[PDB]
UniProtKB/Swiss-Prot annotation:
GO molecular function: D-mannose binding
Protein name in the entry: Type 1 fimbrin D-mannose specific adhesin
Family: Belongs to the fimbrial protein family.
GO biological process, one term: cell-substrate adhesion
Cystine pairings recorded for this chain: none
Stated role: Involved in regulation of length and mediation of adhesion of type 1 fimbriae (but not necessary for the production of fimbriae). Adhesin responsible for the binding to D-mannose. It is laterally positioned at intervals in the structure of the type 1 fimbriae. In order to integrate FimH in the fimbriae FimF and FimG are needed.
Main localization category: other
Amino acid sequence: FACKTANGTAIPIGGGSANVYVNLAPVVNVGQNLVVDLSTQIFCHNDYPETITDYVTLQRGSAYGGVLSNFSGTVKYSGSSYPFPTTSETPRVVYNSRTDKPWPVALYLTPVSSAGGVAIKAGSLIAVLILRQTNNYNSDDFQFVWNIYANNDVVVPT
Ligand SMILES: CCCCCCCO[C@H]1O[C@H](CO)[C@@H](O)[C@H](O)[C@@H]1O
C-alpha cells in the first residue's frame, strides 16, 4: 500500500509524510463553503490485492492558521460528514485494487461570523490529515501524513 499526490510526490510502503499544495477559491462569503477536495489530490493503491485487503481511515484531521481561526469545518469521508477538526477516527475504506483510487476526503469550510479580510494566507499550513492504513494480512499499522498548504490568499468580504 502506498500513496501519491497529483504532482507525483509519493509516500511509500510503511508510511511517511508529504506536502500537498492546493488552490483555493479566492473569495468566500459568510454563508458559503470553501471546498478543499483532496480526492483530486491524493491517490492510493493496494500492492497485493491478490491476497491482501487494505483498510484506510482518516485517523484524524487538524486545522491550522486561518482555517482554525476563521472557519467552521466539516470533513466528508467517502460520502459521510463529520466535524473538522475531527473528534473520532472514521470508518474504514477498502483498498482492494492495484489501480490508483482517490482518497475520498473533502473539507467544507464556512467562514465564522468574526471572519473578514484575508482569512487564509498564501503559503500557510491550513490542515494536517492523517491517513491510517491497516490490512487483513499482518500487523501493519501505518500513518500517511498529509500536510496541506494554501497556494493563495482567501478573502472573506466585509
Ligand atoms: C509473498 C508475500 C508478499 C507480501 C507482500 C506484502 C506487501 O505489503 C505492502 O502492501 C500490502 C498491500 O497493499 C499492505 O497491506 C502492506 O501494509 C504493505 O504496504
